[PDB]
Amino acid sequence: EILDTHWELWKKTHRKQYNNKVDEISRRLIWEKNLKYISIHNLEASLGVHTYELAMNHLGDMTSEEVVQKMTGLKVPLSHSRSNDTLYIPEWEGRAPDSVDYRKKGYVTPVKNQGQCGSCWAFSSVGALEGQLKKKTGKLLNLSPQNLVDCVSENDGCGGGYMTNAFQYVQKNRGIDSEDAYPYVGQEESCMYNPTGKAAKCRGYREIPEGNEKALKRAVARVGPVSVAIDASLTSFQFYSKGVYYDESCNSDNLNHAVLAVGYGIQKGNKHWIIKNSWGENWGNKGYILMARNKNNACGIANLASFPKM
């Protein structure tokens, strides 16, 4: 009931300003809605209606359609399907483990905050484009998603874009800078790539078969981090916190987010997919979210995946 005092706490805790009480008391009202949702959901879990738990994050004030409007970025491109093309990837008749995590392997890097910009496409590519720089150079550094943002003329930069276009670019341009020499700002600028700061390179990419969650599983185990696309326009997704994630409402045709599969595995009876995100370290479980695996292609986890070849 003392929500009055707390909202302030949750306010100060973050960078909540709200200049002019106009929107102030408004966002706070929405806060109560979400907070309300969490309460219910987390109760339906204790009973066993769901298999995951939710909690408040720096996105309490915002709303579902909002984030899906200013913190996504995916831009499903034109046709490409073939299943025998040049960039297609047909795993070889070998064997795949039972569970892998590319974090314990130091193949992944800390999570960042794309911010209020459709930099998901760049943050997603700048992730797999990293896991390789480790699996070939042995040294893992943090590339720059900004680089692509204001350089990949074929992508709406802060306005939207795809991944197979970044891999293509980073390559065709002869190299991608490094966040250490081109800092992300989250606003769209002028391509100021500095060759004198090459961090990685590309020689092509590969599109994982369409739908094959099995192909997704082997690719990650044989190649490493894999840039994937998903449907992140659900309240359950936005307030995730722990446990495997599965909402029977996620759509396989509404792809609006691009994340990174840092491996897979099973947990407490349910399989899963370990995914790194770009919504700050506060979101979910320190930045990653366990997404149901081998469960009818939830949120289209294996609908539009791909990775670069260093």
Swiss-Prot record:
Indicate how the chain sits in the lipid bilayer: Peripheral membrane protein
The processes (GO biological process) annotated in the record are: bone resorption; collagen catabolic process; extracellular matrix disassembly; mitophagy; negative regulation of cartilage development; proteolysis; proteolysis involved in protein catabolic process; thyroid hormone generation
**For this protein, what is the EC number?**
3.4.22.38
Disulfide topology = C117-C158, C151-C191, C250-C299
Q: Which InterPro entries match?
A: Papain-like_cys_pep_sf, Pept_asp_AS, Pept_cys_AS, Pept_his_AS, Peptidase_C1A, Peptidase_C1A_C, Peptidase_C1A_papain-like, Prot_inhib_I29
Which residues have a glycan attached per UniProt?
Answer: N84
Q: Which GO terms describe its molecular function?
A: collagen binding; cysteine-type endopeptidase activity; cysteine-type peptidase activity; fibronectin binding; proteoglycan binding; serine-type endopeptidase activity
Reaction(s) catalysed by this chain, per the record, are:
Broad proteolytic activity. With small-molecule substrates and inhibitors, the major determinant of specificity is P2, which is preferably Leu, Met > Phe, and not Arg
Cellular compartments annotated: Lysosome; Secreted; Apical cell membrane
- Can the keyword Hydrolase be found in this entry's annotation? yes
Q: Among its keywords, does the record have Secreted?
A: yes
List the propeptide residues: 1-95
Which EC class, in a word?
hydrolase
| Cellular component GO terms held in the UniProt record | apical plasma membrane; endolysosome lumen; external side of plasma membrane; extracellular region; extracellular space; intracellular membrane-bounded organelle; lysosomal lumen; lysosome
Q: Which domain of life is it from?
A: Eukaryota
- The name on file for this protein is Cathepsin K
